[PDB]
Amino acid sequence: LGAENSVAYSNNSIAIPTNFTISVTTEILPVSMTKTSVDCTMYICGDSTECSNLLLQYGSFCTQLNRALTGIAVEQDKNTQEVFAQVKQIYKTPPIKDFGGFNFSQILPDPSKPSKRSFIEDLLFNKVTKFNGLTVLPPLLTDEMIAQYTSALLAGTITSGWTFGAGAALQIPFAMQMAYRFNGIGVTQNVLYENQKLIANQFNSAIGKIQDSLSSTASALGKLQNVVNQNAQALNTLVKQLSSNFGAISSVLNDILSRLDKVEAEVQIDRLITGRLQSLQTYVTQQLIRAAEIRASANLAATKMSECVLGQSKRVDFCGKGYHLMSFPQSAPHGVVFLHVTYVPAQEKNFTTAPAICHDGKAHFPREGVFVSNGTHWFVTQRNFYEPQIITTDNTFVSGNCDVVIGIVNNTVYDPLQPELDS
């Protein structure tokens, strides 16, 4: 299974991360499959009138099989709108890219591309790769229209945080937009500004590594490729079935029509109709059940979009390893790609710790964070990033005498009012 780990638990000990690292992780979802339709009259009978008059004896079989495929063919567009049409106005970013050193130039639209794709969208459209009364119908949105919405969502996110999701887009300097998203993961905003140059480089490097990841191997894109393959596979099989005799004397209907008396033909052809019709009913059942699976994935993508792009996640591991900071969409064949951006705690240190401190009889508790000691001094610290500060009457609150709390310890809680009154 994996490497074993006895976690070094003891009631007096805690580990706090002294440092952190930004990560970016790719996630890929199917959203809509190849729209198809069949003229069953043409497929079954090859436009023999003789055969068509036998097909009337089965009544409303052909019409309902064409109805079901037309129903699937509509909802493939609706799935695509549910994912991408979540932004009501086409935002675009001002020309100067002074996002505090963060460098989106890989994922923004590239002005060189005539279809207005980003650099990484233009990888995805390359890593992913019929004619007998069957048809394919093209999608309602062109791949350029999808690339417009995956610009608008990206420009809105860079310029205005959650606000364009909640209401109208409100500008905020991008450094501050990260500062509030940092408070969102319970790491205090001063940690961001005090480290900003390091943060922008840890982010920009990870975008750099995604170019390599999606250039160097196709292996991840298999999850979209399968939707193309399966529909090509089904259509190829549905055609090769026309070679099946079905216990008639030939697969070529013109043989029976040329060689036989009506009395014999109206037996032979009725085997072919029975066979071909059951062959089509098999395909239509497969498409209904396959469409139900793709629609479940489209609704998951629509949720990922509304929660992890338009907002910030408080749902652990809904949007990648680490605590969630932000996410970006990129458009892809039959699907969508997310670039989640996340915070990961990166360098433990051990500390001795206590649930409370007793002063002069008063039991003090931290207002936020944990009481820790390096061995001689007692500090409050914020939980997810080490920042030792002296325990004091303004970073604490009091409840009762010492005795109630298990394992309480003694240190003076310093009182910042006093030297002013000493003036």
């Binding site: 339709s37 003229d39 009259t41 043409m42 436009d47 064409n66 037309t70």
Partner: protein, 50 residues
């Protein structure tokens, strides 16, 4: 209307196939021959093969 079995139809797009969806198919004539076939040479043979 016939394709939907309804005298009234809503705003939309509807598939159909009826008008002859392929152009002018039509079939006639054969390759040629030189004689009447020799059946009488067998059918009125004097005595048949073993």
């Amino acid at each position: 209307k016939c394709t939907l079995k309804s005298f009234t139809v809503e705003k939309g797009i509807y598939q159909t196939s009826n008008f002859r969806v392929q152009p002018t198919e039509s079939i006639v004539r054969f390759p040629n021959i030189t004689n009447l076939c020799p059946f009488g040479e067998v059918f009125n043979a004097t005595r048949f093969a073993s």
